[PDB]
Amino acid sequence: DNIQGITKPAIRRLARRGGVKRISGLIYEETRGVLKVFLENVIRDAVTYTEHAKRKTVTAMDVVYALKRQGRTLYGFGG
Amino acid sequence: DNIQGITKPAIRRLARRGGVKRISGLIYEETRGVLKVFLENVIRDAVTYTEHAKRKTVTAMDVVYALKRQGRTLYGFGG
Amino acid sequence: PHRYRPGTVALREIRRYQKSTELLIRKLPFQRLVREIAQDFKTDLRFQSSAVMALQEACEAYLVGLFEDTNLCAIHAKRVTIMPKDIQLARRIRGE
Amino acid sequence: HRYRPGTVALREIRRYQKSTELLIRKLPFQRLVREIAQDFKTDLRFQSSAVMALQEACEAYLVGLFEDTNLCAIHAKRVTIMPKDIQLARRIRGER
Amino acid sequence: RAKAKSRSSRAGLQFPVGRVHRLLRKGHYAERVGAGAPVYLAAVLEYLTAEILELAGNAARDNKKTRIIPRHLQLAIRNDEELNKLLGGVTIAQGGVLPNIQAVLLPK
Amino acid sequence: AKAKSRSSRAGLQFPVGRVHRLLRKGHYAERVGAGAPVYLAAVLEYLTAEILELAGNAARDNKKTRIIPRHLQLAIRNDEELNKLLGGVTIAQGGVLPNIQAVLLPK
Amino acid sequence: RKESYSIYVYKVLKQVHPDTGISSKAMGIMNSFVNDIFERIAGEASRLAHYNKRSTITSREIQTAVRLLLPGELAKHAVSEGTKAVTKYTSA
Amino acid sequence: SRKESYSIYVYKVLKQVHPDTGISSKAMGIMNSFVNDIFERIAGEASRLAHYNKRSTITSREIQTAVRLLLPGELAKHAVSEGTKAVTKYTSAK
DNA sequence: CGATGTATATATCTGACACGTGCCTGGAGACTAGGGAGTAATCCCCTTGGCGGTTAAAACGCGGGGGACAGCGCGTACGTGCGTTTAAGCGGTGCTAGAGCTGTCTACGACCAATTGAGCGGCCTCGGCACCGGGATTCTGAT
DNA sequence: ATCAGAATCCCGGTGCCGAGGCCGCTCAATTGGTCGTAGACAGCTCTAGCACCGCTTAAACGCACGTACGCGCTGTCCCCCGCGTTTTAACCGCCAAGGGGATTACTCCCTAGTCTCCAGGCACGTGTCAGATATATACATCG
């Protein structure tokens, strides 16, 4: 039940960065579900890279590669 | 002037295929505008391939490669 | 005289054109427009007979897709008619 | 003393667009990633950077979705973003 | 010298293991190619072909026709809730669209 | 009897020979022509300079003297060609541009 | 000569619906589909080899690429097919 | 365990553009990945443009055509100009 | 008009940036072999050109009622502000799983060659489809 | 409700040009084979990850409350949909002809391969000045 750790304040602040002036009370649980789907679709790839390398430790390059194949290239943690 | 060769009823027929029941009359010049921006992009890429080959005719493969590069792949014309 | 109600025929047009697979823009005018655009990037170009069909298939598929998105935007706006603002929202959410 | 609605939300928007720290807490996210990951393989281990790279991607994705959601919200002439705005945006973006 | 028995017939496949191995080596993917790559790839390409054609024939049978044509391939790909994901960006010439009217447009 | 670098021949700062090696080891083709790595180095140097000039001007607007990622975000998101080149990318620590929609601001 | 996959698609068709023929328009679509998925899988298999500093694409690379590119149930059955093929080929 | 990086050359270019200004190691890492990304894009499309014509090599022309395909129109002119200026200097120095 | 927000000025201090050193492995100078691309000449097909006719479709007008969207109303949903309480962040002690490097050697796949039958381009056809037309049923809606 | 009658449906006949069979045949797959190697395994060892401890106070939480906002009912007028008559250029098809795609045989000058040796830049040691942090306090903004 760690998903409760994405608190409502942590959501509101991200909505503020996105420009949202007024927030409906039903948005949060949908947002959590959306994040859970995104996390699963990234971690499954990361763990597939970890396993092909036979490593037991996940490396940040794996997360970069999971994003890059999925199109959302990240600069800063590698190159 | 040739932009007006795309007639009003042809736009109606395409909007009908995509399930549009009622159409405001301002849409037509906007659609001619959007179509023009699409065509300019694809033809610019096609000519660029044609020139690197030192050809004078545009071939269907030039269009298929341009559309793949733009990310909206076409099946049906070889390749 | 006989007269159908407004939209009685519009649905019939939808049902008719979703069932079929023909091209809908006039071939000759479309080819003339293509030759008018291509004249900017080079002069004395020529086009193979299949190239213009490939362009027409691409453009008609693109516009049908934009129209389905426009219709969803219009329905979201609590309307039945599509208007230009619905295109302008659709293209921005698509990132065009 | 009391400020009226929206005036401090405006101060929040201007602040958090000016500021650039990460806004999700590290420890709860760190556990959430382990909980999700162990269903694919037990007894995994994580480099301390991989969690930060995940948190960066998750915050950026959510911020972009809230942008598109807010445009969908102004098109319906509301100012409140609604769950259906999220659903519509996700559909037009093509992930739903 | 033994009488030849094509590697497809050792794998139990119709797809051409020889050609797919040639194209793996010639395509500049990597500097060495092992014998387990082409058999696996040819098997998966056969599977996906048979998968699409089995759905397309059902639409063709419902059309009461003896021939498959692009309209039927579009009906197959867009109806399967997972093939629509693999080929989501792809558009098929002469294919048309699935019948789709929003419930709000129809009369009471 | 003497050695002089190919990049100083080309009048470039970026390394020609490293790009030539990285090409040959990247399998991108079975041959590489002698002029390609010079051209490619010039293109990369041009784009590097174009990014850094804008980042420097953003730094001067803050009166800072050290470039940090926020200045690279302020560069990329404010040139209509750079943004079109770099749309599918997230920059760490970069944040967003201050950009309230006009309907939201008060009457 | 333009080598094509057409004979192999026709053989496969005559094992799922033995009454049915296929037009040249549909055949050209299938011939493009095969080339597309071939290029995608060989692509990711190459990247997986490069990142681990290995020189070689083996059956493990193709398996891992398949689990990355296809949706889950298709990946399961594709792996079951490739495993059965490679096992029976090894037994030969 | 030695790592290659571009961390000399970005600094040299920065000294030419703004000899007063420093750069943080994070932003140097960003620049390093930016260079690796645009490098991989150009090398990719050059290889495609080779194989479409059934050619075997990459010449300056494939780089030039990839540059015109990938970069927007105002960048493309200036980049192609200094690409050919660089090559004329190289081939005349020889 | 009251009074809370962020901006700006002076000083401390501590460590990230910026510099200096050793040295080794990556690059440059030169000679070599041989094959990927540039060339001159051709063929011929499929592209651009012109013309007739009829007739589908587009164009221009009419009628009008159903849609877009401008207005007043309303009650509740969520922004603001406070006191309670809890656990994320910090500095630290402690270990040891496993990541990363050095050494050995042998399982295997790159590349050659002689061989030959699997797959492509071509002609032919005959029958499935399409084009054609006629009569029955559905459905919209006028009264 | 219902039946006048328009469009969809369904049943039937004609005949053609496309899919599919056989055919020649050649070039890309097969088999037998050596051998350079890099990668599978063995061993080491030292990083940094997980576990545990006490301290801190910033953040999160639950609650009250006030009015701004989304949803609803209502109207109206104007512009689009369905229908009619005209007319124009699309579409079909026949006849011309020649530009430039696509193929070929000769040739060369360009790049990969190889040994070298020496210096560029990458670890490892250093220290100071740019910044964060702290304190101080000014004046801009808002109901």
XYZ file of N, CA, C and O (backbone and C1' of nucleotides) in Angstrom, chain I residues 45-130:
602
model
P 9.332 -1.607 -73.352
O 8.558 -1.158 -72.027
C 9.221 -0.851 -70.802
C 8.792 0.532 -70.333
C 7.284 0.762 -70.397
O 6.808 1.526 -69.311
C 8.372 2.433 -71.616
P 6.638 0.887 -67.853
O 6.230 2.138 -66.952
C 7.076 3.281 -66.760
C 6.444 4.524 -67.384
C 4.935 4.687 -67.134
O 4.596 5.998 -66.721
C 5.441 5.071 -69.367
P 4.827 6.505 -65.221
O 4.889 8.098 -65.377
C 6.058 8.746 -65.873
C 5.734 9.684 -67.032
C 4.570 10.656 -66.816
O 5.060 11.940 -66.461
C 4.701 9.797 -69.067
P 4.049 13.134 -66.105
O 3.807 13.867 -67.503
C 4.905 14.481 -68.176
C 4.519 14.926 -69.576
C 3.388 15.949 -69.629
O 3.783 17.043 -70.454
C 2.902 14.151 -71.054
P 2.872 18.356 -70.592
O 1.975 18.086 -71.893
C 2.557 18.215 -73.204
C 1.652 17.617 -74.271
C 0.232 18.157 -74.296
O 0.193 19.333 -75.094
C 0.402 15.829 -74.917
P -1.101 20.280 -75.144
O -2.118 19.527 -76.125
C -1.801 19.370 -77.513
C -2.808 18.457 -78.197
C -4.255 18.959 -78.133
O -4.727 19.204 -79.466
C -4.105 16.640 -77.606
P -6.081 20.026 -79.738
O -7.270 18.960 -79.716
C -7.428 18.020 -80.784
C -8.479 16.991 -80.422
C -9.850 17.571 -80.071
O -10.725 17.500 -81.211
C -9.229 15.698 -78.696
P -12.190 18.158 -81.165
O -13.145 16.986 -80.636
C -13.338 15.823 -81.449
C -14.207 14.789 -80.749
C -15.586 15.300 -80.337
O -16.589 14.353 -80.735
C -14.459 14.371 -78.468
P -18.152 14.726 -80.700
O -18.712 14.167 -79.312
C -19.036 12.780 -79.149
C -19.614 12.551 -77.766
C -20.705 13.541 -77.380
O -21.676 12.978 -76.518
C -18.978 13.703 -75.836
P -22.909 12.102 -77.045
O -23.552 11.597 -75.669
C -22.981 10.552 -74.881
C -22.884 10.989 -73.426
C -24.065 11.842 -72.944
O -24.478 11.532 -71.599
C -22.066 12.917 -72.453
P -24.845 10.030 -71.183
O -23.517 9.515 -70.451
C -23.443 9.381 -69.010
C -23.390 10.695 -68.207
C -24.747 11.292 -67.773
O -24.805 11.432 -66.370
C -23.242 12.968 -68.446
P -25.128 10.186 -65.409
O -24.079 10.408 -64.230
C -22.786 9.849 -64.341
C -21.804 10.583 -63.452
C -22.303 10.885 -62.046
O -21.268 10.662 -61.106
C -21.972 12.938 -63.281
P -21.496 10.915 -59.539
O -21.099 12.448 -59.377
C -19.822 12.886 -59.792
C -19.800 14.390 -59.932
C -20.113 15.142 -58.647
O -18.910 15.721 -58.155
C -21.272 16.073 -60.547
P -18.871 16.583 -56.808
O -19.067 18.096 -57.285
C -18.212 18.642 -58.293
C -18.768 19.951 -58.820
C -18.953 21.023 -57.749
O -18.262 22.191 -58.156
C -20.947 20.749 -59.009
P -18.132 23.483 -57.218
O -19.344 24.431 -57.645
C -19.370 25.027 -58.940
C -20.745 25.592 -59.231
C -21.213 26.669 -58.251
O -21.283 27.902 -58.946
C -22.945 25.129 -58.791
P -21.469 29.297 -58.181
O -23.043 29.536 -58.117
C -23.761 29.856 -59.296
C -25.250 29.817 -59.034
C -25.707 30.722 -57.890
O -26.801 31.505 -58.339
C -26.554 28.558 -57.591
P -27.481 32.634 -57.422
O -29.018 32.208 -57.376
C -29.392 30.895 -57.000
C -30.894 30.807 -56.853
C -31.434 31.661 -55.729
O -32.779 32.039 -55.987
C -31.459 29.360 -55.100
P -33.643 32.813 -54.876
O -34.405 31.662 -54.067
C -35.346 30.826 -54.726
C -35.801 29.697 -53.819
C -36.406 30.182 -52.504
O -37.827 30.081 -52.552
C -34.974 28.253 -52.228
P -38.751 30.756 -51.422
O -38.819 29.711 -50.212
C -39.465 28.459 -50.387
C -39.142 27.515 -49.244
C -39.496 28.056 -47.859
O -40.493 27.220 -47.280
C -37.305 27.107 -47.888
P -41.311 27.679 -45.980
O -40.414 27.241 -44.735
C -40.186 25.854 -44.492
C -39.162 25.653 -43.396
C -39.473 26.451 -42.130
O -39.300 25.658 -40.967
C -37.282 26.899 -42.850
P -40.484 24.673 -40.509
O -39.848 23.791 -39.342
C -38.968 22.705 -39.621
C -37.756 22.797 -38.714
C -38.096 23.120 -37.262
O -37.220 22.478 -36.360
C -36.705 24.804 -38.122
P -37.467 20.966 -35.883
O -35.992 20.463 -35.535
C -35.064 20.156 -36.564
C -33.700 20.738 -36.233
C -33.275 20.567 -34.779
O -31.924 20.148 -34.726
C -33.272 22.875 -35.356
P -31.201 19.767 -33.344
O -30.003 20.818 -33.263
C -28.894 20.664 -34.135
C -28.094 21.945 -34.223
C -27.372 22.335 -32.948
O -25.981 22.337 -33.201
C -28.807 24.130 -33.701
P -24.913 22.587 -32.032
O -24.640 24.166 -32.054
C -23.974 24.771 -33.158
C -23.891 26.279 -32.980
C -23.057 26.692 -31.791
O -22.315 27.872 -32.112
C -25.329 27.313 -31.434
P -21.160 28.394 -31.133
O -21.889 29.299 -30.053
C -22.490 30.516 -30.448
C -23.361 31.042 -29.338
C -22.687 31.049 -27.961
O -23.009 32.233 -27.264
C -24.714 30.005 -27.806
P -22.080 33.537 -27.357
O -22.895 34.594 -26.489
C -23.839 35.445 -27.116
C -24.961 35.794 -26.164
C -24.509 36.127 -24.746
O -25.166 37.301 -24.278
C -26.080 34.333 -24.719
P -24.791 37.940 -22.855
O -25.885 37.350 -21.849
C -27.206 37.881 -21.870
C -28.133 37.094 -20.965
C -27.750 37.085 -19.494
O -28.496 38.095 -18.803
C -28.589 34.955 -20.284
P -28.213 38.454 -17.260
O -29.116 37.464 -16.378
C -30.545 37.588 -16.397
C -31.219 36.449 -15.639
C -30.866 36.392 -14.150
O -32.059 36.262 -13.363
C -30.345 34.315 -15.203
P -32.005 36.382 -11.759
O -31.756 34.893 -11.224
C -32.778 33.910 -11.393
C -32.258 32.505 -11.127
C -31.752 32.229 -9.703
O -32.661 31.322 -9.059
C -30.364 31.255 -11.382
P -32.689 31.149 -7.461
O -31.608 30.022 -7.128
C -31.916 28.645 -7.379
C -30.687 27.777 -7.196
C -29.977 28.003 -5.860
O -29.528 26.788 -5.279
C -28.467 28.278 -7.627
P -30.522 25.854 -4.432
O -29.536 24.771 -3.788
C -29.021 23.671 -4.528
C -27.562 23.487 -4.155
C -27.273 23.595 -2.656
O -26.254 22.698 -2.231
C -25.989 25.169 -3.800
P -26.536 21.142 -1.957
O -25.156 20.435 -2.368
C -24.710 20.336 -3.724
C -23.373 21.042 -3.910
C -22.302 20.680 -2.861
O -21.071 20.220 -3.430
C -22.402 23.006 -3.242
P -20.916 18.733 -4.019
O -19.482 18.768 -4.728
C -19.221 19.569 -5.872
C -18.058 20.509 -5.585
C -16.810 19.844 -4.997
O -15.788 19.806 -5.977
C -17.333 21.929 -3.926
P -14.392 19.069 -5.703
O -13.417 20.218 -5.149
C -13.147 21.361 -5.968
C -12.699 22.560 -5.145
C -11.354 22.429 -4.417
O -10.621 23.640 -4.514
C -12.984 23.111 -2.926
P -9.017 23.647 -4.598
O -8.610 25.057 -3.955
C -8.845 26.250 -4.673
C -8.836 27.454 -3.745
C -7.545 27.680 -2.973
O -7.301 29.085 -2.848
C -9.294 27.179 -1.451
P -5.933 29.642 -2.220
O -6.251 29.875 -0.667
C -7.124 30.925 -0.271
C -7.448 30.846 1.214
C -6.231 30.883 2.140
O -6.235 32.091 2.890
C -7.845 29.258 2.829
P -4.954 32.531 3.750
O -5.193 31.868 5.177
C -6.263 32.294 6.000
C -6.405 31.350 7.168
C -5.116 31.159 7.975
O -5.282 31.693 9.294
C -6.235 29.098 7.555
P -4.050 31.779 10.319
O -4.201 30.507 11.280
C -5.282 30.423 12.204
C -5.417 29.012 12.752
C -4.227 28.513 13.582
O -4.533 28.579 14.979
C -5.126 26.825 12.106
P -3.422 28.250 16.097
O -3.574 26.686 16.418
C -4.771 26.205 17.009
C -4.764 24.689 17.173
C -3.697 24.139 18.129
O -4.237 23.057 18.917
C -3.350 23.220 15.986
P -3.280 22.094 19.783
O -3.033 20.817 18.842
C -4.139 20.009 18.444
C -3.690 18.767 17.685
C -2.742 17.833 18.445
O -3.209 16.486 18.328
C -1.817 18.361 16.350
P -2.428 15.260 19.011
O -1.417 14.730 17.883
C -1.883 13.982 16.748
C -0.713 13.617 15.848
C 0.463 12.963 16.583
O 1.067 11.924 15.832
C 1.231 14.759 15.361
P 0.448 10.449 15.758
O 1.187 9.812 14.487
C 0.949 10.263 13.153
C 2.240 10.743 12.500
C 3.473 9.862 12.793
O 4.168 9.451 11.638
C 3.983 12.138 12.935
P 3.658 8.273 10.680
O 4.855 8.191 9.616
C 5.019 9.177 8.616
C 6.453 9.694 8.622
C 7.561 8.628 8.630
O 8.499 8.853 7.603
C 8.012 10.310 10.203
P 8.197 8.518 6.066
O 9.096 9.616 5.312
C 8.530 10.872 4.938
C 9.597 11.948 4.750
C 10.860 11.532 4.008
O 11.342 12.628 3.239
C 11.403 12.080 6.257
P 12.706 12.541 2.398
O 13.824 13.178 3.358
C 13.768 14.570 3.709
C 14.839 14.927 4.733
C 16.262 14.512 4.332
O 17.135 15.631 4.401
C 15.797 13.815 6.532
P 18.683 15.495 3.997
O 19.442 15.189 5.374
C 19.577 16.223 6.346
C 20.246 15.719 7.613
C 21.634 15.126 7.390
O 22.640 16.067 7.732
C 20.322 13.881 8.998
P 24.183 15.739 7.429
O 24.713 14.885 8.677
C 24.776 15.475 9.969
C 25.162 14.457 11.031
C 26.458 13.697 10.715
O 27.305 13.645 11.868
C 24.713 12.165 11.125
P 28.788 13.023 11.783
O 28.604 11.445 11.970
C 28.082 10.970 13.202
C 27.719 9.496 13.155
C 28.852 8.536 12.799
O 29.552 8.156 13.978
C 26.668 7.813 12.120
P 30.825 7.179 13.918
O 30.209 5.705 14.047
C 29.515 5.327 15.236
C 28.944 3.923 15.124
C 29.986 2.855 14.771
O 29.829 1.691 15.585
C 28.196 2.769 13.249
P 30.957 0.544 15.580
O 30.620 -0.424 14.349
C 29.535 -1.341 14.439
C 29.213 -1.958 13.086
C 30.384 -2.561 12.316
O 30.599 -3.922 12.696
C 28.629 -1.660 10.934
P 31.723 -4.793 11.952
O 30.936 -5.454 10.727
C 29.805 -6.288 10.980
C 29.045 -6.582 9.702
C 29.834 -7.360 8.643
O 29.026 -8.346 7.993
C 29.056 -5.346 7.727
P 29.695 -9.761 7.635
O 28.565 -10.622 6.888
C 27.475 -10.032 6.157
C 27.903 -9.528 4.779
C 28.857 -10.434 3.972
O 28.299 -10.826 2.715
C 29.394 -8.144 3.770
P 27.339 -12.107 2.569
O 26.491 -11.767 1.253
C 25.262 -11.082 1.344
C 24.990 -10.298 0.069
C 25.111 -11.054 -1.245
O 24.140 -10.538 -2.152
C 26.786 -9.369 -1.153
P 23.991 -11.046 -3.669
O 25.045 -10.143 -4.463
C 24.751 -8.775 -4.751
C 25.894 -8.134 -5.507
C 26.362 -8.947 -6.712
O 26.773 -8.137 -7.803
C 28.165 -8.637 -5.268
P 25.760 -7.582 -8.915
O 26.516 -6.268 -9.436
C 26.634 -5.096 -8.637
C 28.061 -4.557 -8.679
C 28.666 -4.382 -10.072
O 29.246 -3.091 -10.178
C 30.100 -5.703 -8.708
P 29.684 -2.480 -11.595
O 31.205 -2.935 -11.791
C 32.228 -2.301 -11.026
C 33.562 -3.019 -11.163
C 34.062 -3.234 -12.600
O 35.304 -2.561 -12.767
C 34.331 -5.183 -11.297
P 36.199 -2.725 -14.089
O 37.300 -3.821 -13.694
C 38.296 -3.478 -12.737
C 39.294 -4.605 -12.513
C 40.023 -5.083 -13.777
O 41.438 -5.040 -13.577
C 39.054 -6.930 -12.627
P 42.454 -5.466 -14.750
O 42.881 -6.979 -14.432
C 43.684 -7.255 -13.288
C 43.950 -8.743 -13.130
C 44.683 -9.389 -14.313
O 45.805 -10.149 -13.859
C 42.716 -10.604 -13.791
P 46.797 -10.857 -14.913
O 46.196 -12.323 -15.135
C 46.332 -13.295 -14.105
C 45.653 -14.601 -14.473
C 46.103 -15.225 -15.796
O 46.837 -16.431 -15.534
C 43.717 -15.288 -15.528
P 47.577 -17.226 -16.718
O 46.487 -18.264 -17.249
C 46.036 -19.313 -16.391
C 44.860 -20.047 -17.002
C 45.133 -20.629 -18.388
O 45.139 -22.053 -18.308
C 42.974 -19.584 -18.225
P 45.606 -22.951 -19.552
O 44.292 -23.193 -20.417
C 43.168 -23.883 -19.883
C 42.016 -23.753 -20.848
C 42.362 -24.212 -22.265
O 41.322 -24.975 -22.840
C 41.516 -22.020 -22.305
P 41.101 -26.508 -22.423
O 39.701 -26.866 -23.101
C 38.471 -26.341 -22.610
C 37.727 -25.649 -23.740
C 37.779 -26.390 -25.084
O 36.511 -26.418 -25.718
C 38.444 -24.168 -25.380
P 35.421 -27.548 -25.377
O 34.049 -26.858 -25.821
C 33.371 -25.952 -24.957
C 32.670 -24.874 -25.769
C 31.774 -25.363 -26.889
O 30.646 -24.493 -26.981
C 33.595 -24.125 -27.800
P 29.541 -24.628 -28.135
O 30.026 -23.620 -29.277
C 29.822 -22.210 -29.125
C 30.342 -21.465 -30.336
C 29.835 -22.044 -31.652
O 29.508 -21.027 -32.596
C 32.167 -21.972 -31.680
P 28.056 -20.340 -32.592
O 28.250 -19.051 -33.511
C 29.053 -17.952 -33.120
C 30.059 -17.677 -34.213
C 29.495 -17.646 -35.625
O 30.215 -16.713 -36.397
C 31.140 -19.247 -35.522
P 29.523 -15.839 -37.547
O 30.784 -15.270 -38.341
C 31.708 -14.394 -37.708
C 32.946 -14.242 -38.565
C 32.631 -14.017 -40.024
O 33.545 -13.081 -40.572
C 33.680 -16.158 -39.715
P 33.344 -12.512 -42.054
O 34.032 -13.600 -42.996
C 35.416 -13.895 -42.849
C 35.764 -15.181 -43.562
C 35.324 -15.224 -45.029
O 36.489 -15.289 -45.851
C 34.875 -17.264 -43.926
P 36.419 -15.092 -47.440
O 37.044 -16.450 -47.998
C 36.520 -17.693 -47.601
C 37.251 -18.824 -48.291
C 36.836 -19.032 -49.730
O 37.919 -19.576 -50.495
C 36.001 -20.800 -48.341
P 37.860 -19.598 -52.101
O 37.133 -20.967 -52.487
C 37.793 -22.217 -52.337
C 36.777 -23.342 -52.321
C 35.938 -23.495 -53.587
O 36.548 -24.461 -54.448
C 34.700 -23.893 -51.555
P 35.992 -24.740 -55.929
O 34.914 -25.916 -55.760
C 35.350 -27.220 -55.351
C 34.178 -28.180 -55.195
C 33.363 -28.384 -56.468
O 33.007 -29.765 -56.612
C 31.991 -27.429 -54.764
P 32.132 -30.278 -57.859
O 30.611 -30.138 -57.384
C 30.166 -30.840 -56.230
C 28.826 -30.313 -55.748
C 27.669 -30.433 -56.750
O 26.807 -31.499 -56.367
C 27.596 -28.441 -55.447
P 25.718 -32.084 -57.390
O 24.405 -31.198 -57.161
C 23.619 -31.345 -55.978
C 22.424 -30.413 -56.027
C 21.592 -30.547 -57.300
O 20.192 -30.465 -57.036
C 22.258 -28.317 -57.032
P 19.367 -31.743 -56.519
O 18.065 -31.103 -55.830
C 18.103 -30.492 -54.539
C 17.377 -29.158 -54.585
C 15.995 -29.172 -55.243
O 15.117 -28.213 -54.660
C 17.359 -27.684 -56.389
P 14.268 -28.496 -53.327
O 13.871 -27.013 -52.866
C 14.745 -26.265 -52.037
C 14.548 -24.764 -52.224
C 13.114 -24.243 -52.179
O 13.084 -22.992 -51.499
C 14.051 -23.866 -54.353
P 11.726 -22.157 -51.328
O 11.798 -21.096 -52.527
C 12.756 -20.040 -52.462
C 12.724 -19.158 -53.701
C 11.440 -18.353 -53.947
O 11.792 -16.989 -54.234
C 11.948 -19.672 -55.848
P 10.696 -15.817 -54.344
O 10.744 -15.364 -55.883
C 11.891 -14.638 -56.361
C 11.963 -14.634 -57.883
C 10.826 -13.895 -58.601
O 11.371 -12.788 -59.343
C 11.194 -16.065 -59.547
P 10.425 -11.705 -60.065
O 10.270 -12.198 -61.582
C 11.417 -12.224 -62.444
C 11.083 -12.844 -63.794
C 9.934 -12.163 -64.537
O 10.255 -12.055 -65.940
C 9.427 -14.443 -64.187
P 9.253 -11.370 -66.998
O 8.380 -12.558 -67.621
C 8.970 -13.464 -68.558
C 7.998 -14.571 -68.931
C 6.670 -14.104 -69.533
O 6.699 -14.272 -70.950
C 6.413 -15.946 -68.013
P 5.500 -13.740 -71.877
O 4.455 -14.950 -71.945
C 4.839 -16.175 -72.572
C 3.824 -17.274 -72.309
C 2.425 -17.020 -72.881
O 2.081 -18.080 -73.798
C 2.315 -17.742 -70.614
P 0.763 -18.000 -74.716
O -0.394 -18.610 -73.808
C -0.358 -19.990 -73.463
C -1.323 -20.278 -72.337
C -2.777 -19.905 -72.617
O -3.515 -21.077 -72.981
C -2.068 -19.440 -70.356
P -5.045 -20.978 -73.451
O -5.896 -21.107 -72.112
C -5.831 -22.270 -71.294
C -6.547 -21.984 -69.998
C -7.987 -21.500 -70.208
O -8.917 -22.116 -69.316
C -6.785 -19.998 -68.857
P -9.305 -23.663 -69.492
O -10.328 -23.960 -68.297
C -9.970 -23.832 -66.921
C -10.801 -22.708 -66.320
C -12.265 -22.704 -66.785
O -13.154 -22.558 -65.686
C -11.366 -20.578 -66.997
P -13.521 -23.812 -64.756
O -14.021 -23.148 -63.386
C -13.101 -22.537 -62.476
C -13.525 -21.112 -62.162
C -15.040 -20.921 -61.991
O -15.348 -20.053 -60.904
C -14.237 -19.424 -63.585
P -15.449 -20.597 -59.394
O -15.232 -19.279 -58.511
C -13.921 -18.853 -58.168
C -13.881 -17.354 -57.919
C -14.990 -16.799 -57.040
O -14.470 -15.791 -56.177
C -15.210 -15.962 -59.290
P -15.444 -14.939 -55.228
O -15.591 -13.558 -56.012
C -14.430 -12.809 -56.369
C -14.740 -11.881 -57.529
C -15.750 -10.781 -57.218
O -15.062 -9.536 -57.154
C -16.225 -11.870 -59.323
P -15.793 -8.191 -56.683
O -16.381 -7.562 -58.032
C -15.498 -7.084 -59.064
C -16.280 -6.790 -60.331
C -17.436 -5.818 -60.154
O -17.621 -5.039 -61.346
C -18.279 -7.816 -60.938
